[PDB]
Amino acid sequence: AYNCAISVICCVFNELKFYQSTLSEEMSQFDFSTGVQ
Amino acid sequence: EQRFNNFLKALQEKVEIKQLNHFWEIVVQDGITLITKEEASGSSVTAEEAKKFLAKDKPSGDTAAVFEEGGDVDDLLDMI
Known part of the structure; x- marks a missing residue:
């Protein structure tokens, strides 16, 4: 509850008084043929 | 004379610090005749x-209402 109160204090009460490639293509094709990423 | 002059000062400040609906406004508008000192003129x-x-007139001050645990509520109602 106090963490949620801190969160809601983060915006309201901003003041005081807080209320206390070809090679890449080839590699991909080889990986696809191998079926291993 | 001066005794009732300081009496006038006392009663005027007392009614001022008092808060009424039909307050000294009626008194003042009839107090157009000698609500203040007259023993030596000038002053x-x-x-x-x-x-x-x-x-x-100017309003200021936070958490000054009835039941301060509602004063934060009064402060709470300032965001919408």
């Missing part, structure tokens, strides 16, 4: 002028 007239208009 008498200027004091009468000062006391006639009761002197300003």
Whole structure:
């Protein structure tokens, strides 16, 4: 509850008084043929 | 004379600090006749002028309402 109160204090009460490639293509094709990423 | 002059000062400040609906406004609008000192002139007239208009207005101060645990609620109602 106090963490949620801190969160809601983060915006309201901003003041005081807080209320206390070809090679890449080839590699991909080889990986696809191998079926291993 | 001067005794009732300081009495007038005391009663005027007492009604001022008092808050009423039919407050000294009725008294003042009828208190157009000698609500202030008159024993030595000069100071008498200027004091009468000062006391006639009761002197300003400006609101300030946080958490000053009834039941302060609602004053934060009053502060709570300031975001929408």
